[PDB]
């Protein structure tokens, strides 16, 4: 598989991920990691596009101790609302994004969580797939 990368390790919160797309890896760094996640985090993200991103959606599947906490879907790019300057870029393009993500604030109870993040297009074709482990500890 792909290497395990660290997105984030500070303020008691550590986020480690592996790309779950057999075709390729991607780069991700998160600024101002902590157990008290502030709203609207800044990230850096690098990837090659495997589909056009006129229509781009994110699934989040969260678990802890072998059972589902949360499933969530969110659009990043849609025809009626491109949220980001990168919307509409095309298959094959190298993308670098350094900017905000507009997540809500949240406190992370100590413990370990398994996160599956998937970016996909309107046909459910893979743009990115991240298998992450999030560890919250005392700080």
């Amino acid at each position: 598989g792909w290497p395990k990368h660290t997105a984030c390790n500070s303020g008691g919160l550590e986020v480690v991920y592996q790309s779950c797309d057999p075709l390729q890896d991607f780069g991700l760094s998160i600024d101002q990691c902590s157990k008290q996640i502030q709203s609207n985090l800044n990230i850096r993200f690098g990837i090659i596009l495997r589909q056009d991103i006129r229509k781009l959606f994110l699934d989040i599947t969260l678990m802890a101790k072998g059972s589902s906490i949360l499933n969530y879907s969110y659009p990043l790019c849609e025809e009626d609302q491109p949220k980001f300057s990168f919307c509409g870029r095309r298959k094959g393009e190298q993308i670098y994004y350094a900017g905000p993500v507009n997540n809500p604030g949240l406190d992370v109870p100590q413990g370990e969580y398994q996160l599956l993040l998937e970016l996909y297009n309107e046909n459910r074709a893979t743009v990115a797939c991240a298998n992450a482990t999030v560890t919250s500890s005392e700080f």
Binding site: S85, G88, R90, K91, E93
Partner: protein, 601 residues
């Protein structure tokens, strides 16, 4: 190898195979070749010469550094060529000599700093040119590039900062042109550059200086002007001053998404009086003042993804000409109030989806006076309670979408009564009891009813059910309804049905008896519990046009021979036969029924 044959002799997908040349096994007749993510450090006169019939060729990210003389010499029929994301060092004068009728060319993120990198003197009928994500700093087309058939010129994500008269005159021969400058920070436009200019679309997405754009576009006529910004851009202060130039322009439709409008002046839109459509998606609006001048003849308004508390806060008295209003995805629970839209007498379409709307009594008070409404979208909301004749205020409705919105309807009530023109009704996951005989009274014109994810008492559709009043019904979706059975007479009154989706239930073969009176239908039985289909049901199947039996526990024993023989005789009536597999006997489990022949004697 091994390329995917998408269409025999016609369409091949060879993406991601690490190929250094076109495979010898691809037929000379190939018309559509998807060759992205291979490895072609140089392409030249010998690379493609046998593929004379290509109309579509995609070389996205193929590691191409060189395009030598006559590379495309045999591609006389080429319509689309995609060279996106190749690190091109040079492209020969004659590289495009072959495809003289080329229509669309993608040269995105090829590292180029100038349009003259691409020798296009042979492409006299070019319609689309995509030059995004490069180092280009001028839109000026090179001398002797024909612009006459050019309809799309796309420079998304480049380094253009100025548009001069000279730049603009290089486009004069094109007509109805859509020019995309999204992601270019335009800091100046030469006065006079847009005199008499006529565009289909102009996109300046993300630009940091709206004042400059409106002033620079003086005298232009534009069908769609896209001036939205994005979550990752800096805000500029929005006030009436920004829009002064619009008073000297003709524009049909304008988008201003994600700019910071919050606490807007009542004078903000006084230059917008020519606009037909205005899009204020996600502009941090919490309310609009009354006497918001300059929009009294606007036809379409989008206020989605804002933060109103009440529908009365849009001040609909501002927009007496509106025919279309979208306010979906509001970020707070939206209270619809009573009569908040009553002066929109011309309103034809209303989208109030994803608004967390909840009410004990919908929708006469909320939609008071909307007597011309034809399309209404209340999907993805919180529970709405509907009494009989819930839509008396909108008797002309033709489409009503309530998907994923829970509906509470008292026993024996008829909420859709007197919607005599309604043709399309979506109640997917509304969780109604579909056995109530009166539920659908008053829908004589209904053609299309989606009831995915609703329920019947004990998973059974009885002879008496809500559907038997829908005499014009053509399309019925009952998938994911937890169905065990359907009475043979359940659908007998429904004589015009031609598309019946019963997929993702637990139906067994006797459910087919409910379709006995129908002919030539599309019948989706995918993902049910059909195993054995006895002979007396086969004439019912024969009557139909298309049946889908994929993902059923189908029986491939002698107990099922009559169906098995029928199956072989009627492949033209069957959809997804490659996923229509035996479940028994264990020896044949996972085998396609098309591959089964039994001898039973």
């Amino acid at each position: 190898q091994k390329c995917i044959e998408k269409e025999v002799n016609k369409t091949y997908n060879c993406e991601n195979l690490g190929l250094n040349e076109i495979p010898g096994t691809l037929p000379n007749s190939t018309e559509c070749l998807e060759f992205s993510f291979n490895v072609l450090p140089t392409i030249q006169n010998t690379t493609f010469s046998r593929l004379i019939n290509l109309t579509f060729l995609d070389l996205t990210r193929c590691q191409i550094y060189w395009i030598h003389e006559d590379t495309f010499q045999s591609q006389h029929r080429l319509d689309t060529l995609v060279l996106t994301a190749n690190p091109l060092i040079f492209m020969a004068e004659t590289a495009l000599s072959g495809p003289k009728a080329l229509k669309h060319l993608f040269f995105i993120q090829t590292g180029i700093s100038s349009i003259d990198f691409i020798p296009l003197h042979n492409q006299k009928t070019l319609e689309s040119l995509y030059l995004g994500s490069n180092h280009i700093s001028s839109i000026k087309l090179p001398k002797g590039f024909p612009t006459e058939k050019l309809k799309v010129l796309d420079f998304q994500n480049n380094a253009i900062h100025y548009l001069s008269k000279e730049d603009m005159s290089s486009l004069q021969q094109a007509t109805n042109l859509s020019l995309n400058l999204n992601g270019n920070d335009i800091a100046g436009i030469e006065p006079g550059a847009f005199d008499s200019a006529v565009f289909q679309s102009l996109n300046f997405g993300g630009t940091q200086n709206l004042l400059v754009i409106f002033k620079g576009l003086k005298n232009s006529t534009i069908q769609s002007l896209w001036l939205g910004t994005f979550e990752d851009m800096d805000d500029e202060d929005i006030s009436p001053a920004v829009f002064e130039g619009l008073c000297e322009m003709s524009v049909e439709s304008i988008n201003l998404q994600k700019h910071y409008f919050f606490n807007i002046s009542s004078n903000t839109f006084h230059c917008f009086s020519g606009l037909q459509e205005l899009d204020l998606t996600a502009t941090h609006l919490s309310e609009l003042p009354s006497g918001l001048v300059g929009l009294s003849t606007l036809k379409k308004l989008v206020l989605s993804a804002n933060k109103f508390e009440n529908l009365c806060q849009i001040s609909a008295s501002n927009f007496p000409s509106l025919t279309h209003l979208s306010i979906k995805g509001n970020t707070k629970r939206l209270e619809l109030g009573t009569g908040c839209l009553e002066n929109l007498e011309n309103l034809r379409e209303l989208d109030l989806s994803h608004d967390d709307i909840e009410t004990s009594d919908c929708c006469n008070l909320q939609l008071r006076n909307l007597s011309h409404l034809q399309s209404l979208n209340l999907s993805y909301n919180e529970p709405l309670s509907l009494k009989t004749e819930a839509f008396k205020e909108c008797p002309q409705l033709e489409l009503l979408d309530l998907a994923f919105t829970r509906l509470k309807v008292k026993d024996a009530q008829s909420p859709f009564q007197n919607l005599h023109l309604l043709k399309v009704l979506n109640l997917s996951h509304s969780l109604l009891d579909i056995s109530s005989e009166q539920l659908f009274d008053g829908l004589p014109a209904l053609q299309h009813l989606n009831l995915q994810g609703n329920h019947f008492p004990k998973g059974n559709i009885q002879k008496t059910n809500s559907l038997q009043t829908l005499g014009r019904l053509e399309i019925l979706v009952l998938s994911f309804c937890d169905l065990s059975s359907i009475d043979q007479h359940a659908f007998t009154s429904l004589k015009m049905m031609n598309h019946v989706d019963l997929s993702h239930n637990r139906l067994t073969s006797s459910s087919i008896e409910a379709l006995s009176h129908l002919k030539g239908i599309y019948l989706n039985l995918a993902s049910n519990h059909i195993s054995i289909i006895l002979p007396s049901l086969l004439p019912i199947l024969s009557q139909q046009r298309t049946i889908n039996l994929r993902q059923n526990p189908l029986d491939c024993t002698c107990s099922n021979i009559y169906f098995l023989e029928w199956y072989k005789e009627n492949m033209q009536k069957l959809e997804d036969t490659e996923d229509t597999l035996c479940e028994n006997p264990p020896l044949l489990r996972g085998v396609r029924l098309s591959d089964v022949t039994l001898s039973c004697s």
